[PDB]
From a paper:
Here, we report the identification of NADases on the surface of fungi such as the pathogen Aspergillus fumigatus and the saprophyte Neurospora crassa. The enzymes harbour a tuberculosis necrotizing toxin (TNT) domain and are predominately present in pathogenic species. Interestingly, N. crassa NADase (NcNADase) activity was not affected by either EGTA or Ca2+. Both AfNADase and NcNADase cleaved NAD+ and NADP+, but not their reduced counterparts, NADH and NADPH. The absence of ADP-ribosyl cyclase activity from the fungal NADase was further substantiated by its inability to convert the NAD+ analogue nicotinamide hypoxanthine dinucleotide (NHD+) to Nam and fluorescent N7-cyclic inosine diphosphoribose (N7-cIDPR), a reaction specifically observed for cyclases. These results demonstrate that fungal NADases are pure NAD glycohydrolases as they lack both cyclase and base-exchange activity.
The 1.6 Å X-ray structure of the homodimeric A. fumigatus protein reveals unique properties including N-linked glycosylation and a Ca2+-binding site whose occupancy regulates activity. The protein crystallizes in the space group P3221 with two molecules in the asymmetric unit confirming the homodimeric assembly suggested from the chromatographic analysis. The dimeric assembly is formed via an interface of 2260 Å2 of the total solvent-accessible area of 11030 Å2 (calculated with PDBePISA server), involving 66 residues, including the C-terminus which is intertwined with the other protomer. The protomers consist of two domains, an N-terminal ‘thumb’ and a C-terminal ‘palm’ domain. The thumb domain, residues 20-117, is folded containing five α-helices connected with loop regions, and the fold is stabilized by two disulfide bridges, C33-80 and C38-50. The palm domain consists of a seven-stranded central β-sheet flanked by two short α-helices and two 310 helices. The location of this binding site is at the dimerization interface, just before the C-terminus turns to intertwine with the other protomer. Noteworthy, an acetate ion, originating from the crystallization solution, is trapped in a cavity located near the domain boarder and facing the central β-sheet (strands β2, 3 and 5). The pentagonal bipyramidal coordination of the metal ion in the crystal structure, the refined density as well as the B-factors indicate that the bound metal ion is Ca2+, in line with the observed Ca2+ activation of the enzyme following EGTA treatment. The Ca2+ ion binding site is comprised of the side chains of D219, E220 and E223 as well as the main chain of S216. Each protomer is glycosylated at three asparagine residues, N45, N95 and N118 and these sites coincide with those originally predicted.
Author numbering:
A (entry chain A): 26 to 233
B (entry chain B): 27 to 234
The structure:
């Protein structure tokens, strides 16, 4: 296991315009050079091959508008829900219960969450969602807990970005920051998701 | 540590001992020894097998009886997550050639998950980790799609003190039949021991 597939050597960054040392090949779209070393992030990225079996320029040519710096990632249709045999998205509106733990790689202006602990490859995100923008949130990784019930679009994640997808995504009608200000989510600190028991479910009632 | 700290002393209170391979001697509570190597240990890293409950509390919540004759009670609608109208969220979907799937259970069943899904995303009871054939420790099987076929595809409801919210694939033929008819092949451990073997080379890029 390594950064680039062996095929990409001896010049794995050929075709890529360097911009800044922090990122693979200097391209922010390729994500950070250094990756998480601690639980749970290392657990969530343990199965993540950043480019699949592709090389950097091949990856951008497949998934973005241009290999050059002006290129932007192209996203799946239908908000990225897995499509059924009639090419309709699979989802339903569902109430998230108080106590449920969610997480997200990305800014709090987004509307896509996952269940706490979902592998990165289940989220069908590009490498740049691992870029750090706030030092207090390395890798742009945020964990939340539902404090008041609310309804989201809930459904399977389509494969994209050379990953299998098939986690569950929650698509909110208010962005994360707005949900926090309105009392629907609260932020969790590392000490609240560092133990196995903190990943279990005490809020769903049993059948008896 | 097999049990929540609150369960000491006498964490097996109320449990009839049957066989020393299982927690409290009870096969419903799963095996004493959990996976030590990759990928299985990665899938169980966030797994607290009783949540915050003690063994008898767990069986009282999720089974018909704490006594040996009690059996686990399963969620309605095949365990698909329910929407605000109490209807299961799923659709018929075609699984593409190349997709990798896994399963804790015998090949006579019909429930698969995407390769690498955490155990807690599957909403399975502890007994699905019991070994029945030495060739398949923890009853863990990995498959790859060799001919496309349609399955019921949808999010997994929380159950058994876990959050669920993986994706499940409910087949119309049992796994054994899908293998015999050429839709699935069995994977050797050597075919899912590297990160790149979890990526997705089969889904095509967007048309540009
Ligand atoms: C996913 O696809 C399912 C079908 O998939 C195919 O089949 C499976 C087994 C795989 O092989 C797969 O690969 C295939 O692609 C689909 O299942 C279908 O669902 C429909 C709708 O629910 C079912 O039709 C209903 O059947 C019942 C039973 O019909 C039999 O018995 C009656 C009573 O004796 C006879 O009169 C019939 O002729 C049949 O012999 C009917 O009662 C029912 O009628 C209802 O709807 C009509 C009008 O639509 C009303 O007038 C009635 O009053 C009823 O309200 C439907 O006809 C169909 O049987 C079923 N197929 C199979 C093979 O089971 C499933 O719905 C799909 N799921 C999703 C989420 O899309
Ligand atoms: C995107 O940019 C392309 C040109 O970029 C070229 O290559 C980079 C690495 C720099 O050397 C730059 O100076 C070069 O001109 C265009 O060919 C392409 O049309 C641009 N995309 C759009 C939509 O205009
Ligand atoms: C899901 O729900 C949408 C409408 O829900 C209502 O409006 C949104 C903006 C939220 O305020 C929500 O809480 C309200 O109940 C529909 O537009 C959409 O079609 C629904 N989708 C499905 C599959 O039911
Ligand atoms: C590249 O961008 C990061 C983002 O903060 C910055 O910390 C770093 O210093 C930049 N590289 C250089 C050489 O300035
Ligand atoms: C316990 O279970 C194992 C596995 O099913 C079996 O081989 C063994 O005979 C059982 N009894 C004892 C006493 O180990
Ligand atoms: C299980 O065994 C107990 C002990 O006799 C009995 O009371 C109970 O009815 C049996 N069946 C179930 C489903 O609990
Ligand atoms: Ca803690
Ligand atoms: Ca291998």
């Amino acid at each position: 296991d390594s950064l680039f597939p062996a095929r990409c050597w001896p010049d794995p960054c050929a075709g890529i315009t360097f911009q800044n040392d922090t990122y693979v090949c200097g391209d922010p779209r390729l994500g950070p050079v250094v990756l998480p070393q601690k639980f749970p992030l290392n657990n969530e990225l343990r199965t993540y091959a950043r480019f699949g079996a592709l090389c950097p320029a091949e990856f951008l040519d497949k998934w973005a508008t241009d290999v050059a710096p002006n290129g932007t990632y192209i996203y799946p249709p239908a908000n990225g829900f897995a499509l059924d045999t009639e090419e309709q998205p699979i989802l339903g509106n569902a109430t998230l219960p108080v106590g449920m733990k969610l997480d997200r790689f990305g800014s709090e202006y987004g509307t896509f969450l996952a269940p706490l602990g979902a592998p990165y490859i289940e989220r069908s995100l590009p490498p740049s969602n691992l870029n750090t923008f706030d030092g207090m949130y390395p890798y742009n990784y945020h964990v939340y807990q539902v404090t008041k019930e609310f309804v989201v679009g809930l459904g399977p994640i389509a494969p994209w970005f050379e990953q299998p997808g098939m986690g569950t995504q929650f698509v909110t009608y208010t962005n994360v920051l707005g949900l926090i200000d309105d009392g629907y989510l609260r932020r969790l600190d590392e000490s609240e998701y560092d133990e196995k028991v903190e990943y279990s479910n005490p809020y769903t009632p049993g059948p008896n």
